[PDB]
Design a protein around this ligand. Structure first.
Ligand SMILES: Nc1ncnc2c1ncn2[C@@H]1O[C@H](CSCC[C@H](N)C(=O)O)[C@@H](O)[C@H]1O
Lengths: 265, 265
């Protein structure tokens, strides 16, 4: 009579922790959602095969409006698992689902998995130096989101790095590329003119973290804006002031222009 | 010819990912370090038994000073693994180790695992709202470090949460407790008087993240400073102003006083 929130990790079915797998294998019912992120290296069947169970996939509406009608009822007489990409409680509104479980008299446990939030460490940028995070959302109709531009500004101002999650329209199979994010940001700079994001801004692109060969690229917007970083998902990072070793890693591992080695302390 | 940076995850031997375990099992040599952090819910013996390989433990000096003489030589003609608690490359100086590998003509791949940077999402605090992170260090002799106090100040000022890592002396196996961290901060506040950390400050304590039964507590310093949060490791967080949903989580899941619903929102 329990509910397990189990993260599946970054790229494929093997990114789940051993703990998550052994527990998932023994659950009576297994649900999952794949709209909060993209696991570009696996498939549902591959996942079902590994866990050895049938997985009922839920839409954003099933979860947000009917979690307590579809999932919680079964958790009262059985052990239920709710699988999600990355870590189940990161950059999502899933934490509130634990409140729903509590109110329905269901105990819940959380099994973590690798998250893009810590995976950014592979960019060479010190993780403690990351400031507030944000999401670049697709404009819709006459609505053009821009708050993420202010986040970058506020962080950069403090010498902190900015992690930018990119938009996703799962039902439309749409995954915002770093290129599209850069285009949108230049447009916002054009509007606000704060000098926050321009053709000369240094950025870092991390694509398909979790795979053995992710694409890690660093450089000026003017040079990367049209570069092909491979299939999604992508995340964009706008570094703040760099430490010598961060610059060195970006140049040696991410192919950044050797000129960034010369930091303006 | 290949070096694998493999994370062991948060708490015990089952926190490594399926991908990480399988890769580690195919490596000719396996190294590990436990000075950046320790796996409090397991032992080297249990990790060794699970991986089915003997594990050579390296000290901080072994890694920082001689990584290229101890680990890289073997990586030239064998598959080598380097295990670390949490997610690889999160520890500040680890990213640079990949540069050493490149310089030695050794290929390196990163296998991610759960990190406290993302696991703190279990506190119900929105991940995007976290600002710069810091480590609370013990004062020693004539040295009284307080930069972590300024980090909290700058974050809270902008409505951001502050993740605080607590001092650890791996070799001596001694952990700074959340209780001690609070005492130090109150002491730092008495000196700087910036109105950053007082008896009325709301804090969150996370202990044994990764275990199936972690300790998650939220409340004011005056009530938690002498509370028993259990065995280490402990993580201290000083939230900025809360979203009502964050406050509700803290009350319903972390036993926070209902008072935060009006005071810290
Ligand atoms: N493997 C990966 N590589 C690059 N970006 C990724 C990624 N996985 C997730 N993301 C980024 O994060 C967004 C989803 S946000 C949800 C994050 C998830 N709970 C976690 O713990 O990672 C995506 O739209 C994308 O921009």
């Amino acid at each position: 009579m329990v509910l397990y929130f189990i993260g599946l990790g970054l790229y494929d079915e093997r990114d789940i922790t051993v703990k998550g797998l052994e527990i998932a294998k023994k659950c009576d019912y297994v649900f999952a959602e794949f709209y909060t992120s993209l696991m570009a290296g696996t498939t549902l069947g591959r996942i079902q095969k590994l866990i050895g169970k049938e997985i009922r996939v839920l839409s954003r509406e099933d979860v947000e409006l009917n979690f307590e009608n579809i999932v919680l009822p079964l958790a009262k007489e059985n052990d239920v698992a709710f699988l999600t990409p990355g870590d189940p409680l990161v950059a999502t509104t899933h934490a509130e689902l634990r409140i729903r479980a509590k109110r329905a008299g269901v105990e819940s446990y959380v099994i973590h998995a690798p998250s893009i939030y810590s995976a950014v460490g592979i960019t060479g940028l010190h993780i403690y130096k990351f400031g507030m995070s944000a999401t670049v959302a697709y404009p819709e109709g006459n609505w053009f989101p821009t708050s993420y531009y202010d986040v970058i500004k506020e962080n950069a101002e403090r010498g902190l790095h900015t992690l930018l999650f990119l938009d996703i329209k799962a039902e439309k199979r749409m995954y915002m590329t770093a290129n599209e994010a850069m285009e949108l940001l230049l447009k916002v700079e054009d509007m606000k003119k704060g000098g926050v994001f321009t053709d000369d801004t240094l950025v870092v692109v991390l694509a398909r973290a979790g795979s053995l060969n992710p694409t890690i690229r660093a450089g000026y917007v003017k040079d990367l804006i049209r570069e092909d970083f491979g299939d999604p998902p992508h995340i964009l990072i706008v570094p703040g002031k760099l430490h010598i070793v961060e610059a060195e890693y970006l140049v040696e591992i991410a192919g950044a222009p050797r000129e960034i080695l010369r930091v303006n302390v």
